[PDB]
Design a protein around this ligand. Sequence first.
Ligand SMILES: Nc1ncnc2c1ncn2[C@@H]1O[C@H](COP(=O)(O)OP(=O)(O)OP(=O)(O)O)[C@@H](O)[C@H]1O
Ligand SMILES: Nc1ncnc2c1ncn2[C@@H]1O[C@H](COP(=O)(O)OP(=O)(O)OP(=O)(O)O)[C@@H](O)[C@H]1O
Ligand SMILES: Nc1ncnc2c1ncn2[C@@H]1O[C@H](COP(=O)(O)OP(=O)(O)O)[C@@H](O)[C@H]1O
Ligand SMILES: [Mg+2]
Ligand SMILES: [Mg+2]
Ligand SMILES: [Mg+2]
Lengths: 243, 325, 311
Amino acid sequence: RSSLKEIEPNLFADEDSPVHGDILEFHGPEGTGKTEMLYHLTARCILPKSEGGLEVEVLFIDTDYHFDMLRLVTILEHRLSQSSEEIIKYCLGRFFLVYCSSSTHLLLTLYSLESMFCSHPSLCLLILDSLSAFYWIDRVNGGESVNLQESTLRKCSQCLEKLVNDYRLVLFATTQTIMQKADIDYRPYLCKAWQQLVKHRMFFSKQDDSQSSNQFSLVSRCLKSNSLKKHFFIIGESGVEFC
Amino acid sequence: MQRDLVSFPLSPAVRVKLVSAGFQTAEELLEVKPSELSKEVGISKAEALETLQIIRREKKCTALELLEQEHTQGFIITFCSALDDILGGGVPLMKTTEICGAPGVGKTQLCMQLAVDVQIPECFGGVAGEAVFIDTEGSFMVDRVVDLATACIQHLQLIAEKHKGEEHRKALEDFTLDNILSHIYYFRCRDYTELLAQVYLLPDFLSEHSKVRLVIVDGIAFPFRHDLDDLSLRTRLLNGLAQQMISLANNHRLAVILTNQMTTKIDRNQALLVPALGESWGHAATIRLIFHWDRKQRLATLYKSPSQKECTVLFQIKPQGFRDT
Amino acid sequence: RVGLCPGLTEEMIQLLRSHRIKTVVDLVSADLEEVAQKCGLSYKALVALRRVLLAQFSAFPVNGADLYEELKTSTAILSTGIGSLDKLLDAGLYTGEVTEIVGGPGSGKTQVCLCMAANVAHGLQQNVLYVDSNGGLTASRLLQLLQAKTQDEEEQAEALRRIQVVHAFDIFQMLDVLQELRGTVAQQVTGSSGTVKVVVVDSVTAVVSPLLGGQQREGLALMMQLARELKTLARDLGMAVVVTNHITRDRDSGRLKPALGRSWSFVPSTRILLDTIEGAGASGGRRMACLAKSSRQPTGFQEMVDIGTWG
Ligand SMILES: Nc1ncnc2c1ncn2[C@@H]1O[C@H](COP(=O)(O)OP(=O)(O)OP(=O)(O)O)[C@@H](O)[C@H]1O
Ligand SMILES: Nc1ncnc2c1ncn2[C@@H]1O[C@H](COP(=O)(O)OP(=O)(O)OP(=O)(O)O)[C@@H](O)[C@H]1O
Ligand SMILES: Nc1ncnc2c1ncn2[C@@H]1O[C@H](COP(=O)(O)OP(=O)(O)O)[C@@H](O)[C@H]1O
Ligand SMILES: [Mg+2]
Ligand SMILES: [Mg+2]
Ligand SMILES: [Mg+2]
């Protein structure tokens, strides 16, 4: 019922099999277009089929409290050929947002979301933002024992893998670059189960030069085939546009 | 409504024990017997009592009351009319003030003049308080203070004679040299550890002596600029000291005066004088003054202030002390 | 525990403690059939208990159109009292998000915060809470700013009475103040004349710098807790939170960047950078404004501000 190529032919030019459970990951520093990419994916997924959409529902989980409905509405109205309030209402009728305040809160939200997931059959995409939102607090609360710094993340990863395997969903996660290492910059620090659960990896970067910005770099790295690709794209009032 | 344990000042061991036990919110332990808490967690009963006391430890003032308090509290005059005019009336209370300058420019003279002036009776527009002087360089000479106090006494006597009142005479009855000298408290710190120890002991001393209105630390650059190669430790100590000093000034309604030194910044094959101790130290103080020579005159520049505007004035040092023109 | 939720008795709680079930997550992360064989409790009561516990202690999603309609009449835009900054910020700053102002000493962060507070207290007539951590707040400057907008003494006094001042000099005092404000606003839902709309933290760097350094990790946890408190205040209660930060230069690259580190770099939803205009042409008031980070505008646009003309 779900096809990965249709979601994004630009980035997913190799994956053509009907997706029946995948885990992806975004990574990079601040202000490099991760949330804009998520907005573009949601816009591609929730638009009507007449305007070039997918007509399936999206679930969103916000952890860093950085979601902006105004930007999403602006992108939707710019992508639409004709702007009308009722069509925007129809589009937004298939969008859901959840807030979590702590690791246990997120764990219980995951333990509760399966009721909706069995209730709603049209869900095809799942987004978790800022998976590394609670790292320092958990680490400090865990003392010097590593196993006490990893339990909540372990349980959340197990629940996420169970959900994605059971309900045939697509997961999009975001992490933050917090620590360096004594061309890809990546110093893994997450849970071992989460690290081994990843399938695709994408890194984000921004041009240092001030050519009015308008240039972002993305490096796609799939662990299945060890294929490294570089993408260039721009972000405008209508969303993101690939160079 | 929920308060997390991480926000409370607890030791890491007891906190991690509580976290591993299963306690996550502050209110969760407000209904647990200390004996049962010690039994389940495994801590001692003294630890349970201490943490229960600590957790139950964490008014309403508007800008109008703050303005009234600011108007009621006066300023400390420097006997330099231009400096007072550009400062807004004088050195303000509840604020941290910093003075920078090249050697032999007049920072210590200003410190002594402020220490003398903080005791002017309120009938003449003063504050009528006492001063605490902390010396880290050994440059405090009593004879200079005696000269300054005698000059101030003569000035006030002349003003009172010109006015020809009755309140002024009564106020000047007790404004003698002995009282002025006895209302200045002196400390000598020969190392930065000693300076930190004295600053730590300061709050109890101020609690005992509630009439103090000025705290002077003549020299913070010298203790921190020698035999200290770990600069991160220096920055941490300086930030802690600045926070402690501003807290003291706000809590005890004082005026804090700090004196800094000048260093040379070498760029584009040009040499400019800048305050020492780095860039992050510039945020520590509330008001920053810079003293320098132009040709032969001495200039005071209000480099930074959150209430006034940048300016520049002229002053000079006389046998009577800090003066103008 | 007794009193946490209905249907829980002390005997059942002790029996569950006998079989290594202590917290809510432990009870939820279990199995109905597997657990009901070591002690043999009620079969269909366990699922009801877990459903009740999930109902109380789990967040619930909302359909997009519903909160779209809700935020249509809830989000407000507050003018800063400066036209150039309003144009740069696209007519002001929105409630429900965190705004950060960065710059070196004398940049003008305190002046901007004071102008915002005066404009909100007088122009919109709403309550403002000011949190001061470095002694940079003065009532004389606020009175001077207000005198340029009105001449009625009673009006000025009424505007001044709407600004609350709080002093916090360490991290624990700031956290206590924020939690007390959260509790007060939660208790004050019914009232509408007196609720605080804008919160200003004069300097978050002044209370976090002493805790950073060495090989420890407590400072990072404390500053993340502070960020969580600020985010909760901004989003849950629909307020506007403005904080200030220091500026630092990278040693290996020579580029100006905000302080407090890469972990703090992710916190604000909007960032404004102030600067002096190359010394010459910026003898006073003339400051250089920029949009370092945003979520609705391209990054890099520059404007012009004058502190001297605000008074
Ligand atoms: N209307 C717009 N036109 C052009 N660029 C825009 C527009 N709106 C936002 N941007 C760009 O979006 C960028 C920030 O993107 P985004 O908010 O997705 O960051 P991010 O990489 O997810 O970072 P973080 O998670 O730390 O917030 C800015 O650099 C800005 O230039
Ligand atoms: N009434 C005024 N008229 C003109 N300029 C003023 C006035 N009050 C303050 N200023 C200006 O404000 C500047 C300092 O701004 P401000 O106090 O906001 O700095 P800041 O960025 O908060 O600094 P800090 O990091 O030291 O806390 C001074 O350089 C001065 O020129
Ligand atoms: N009794 C006095 N009469 C006149 N001038 C004096 C007297 N004592 C000191 N001075 C002048 O005042 C200045 C004092 O500077 P000082 O306080 O030492 O500054 P710093 O501490 O920054 O070196 C000296 O340059 C000196 O010429
Ligand atoms: Mg983002
Ligand atoms: Mg000296
Ligand atoms: Mg300031």
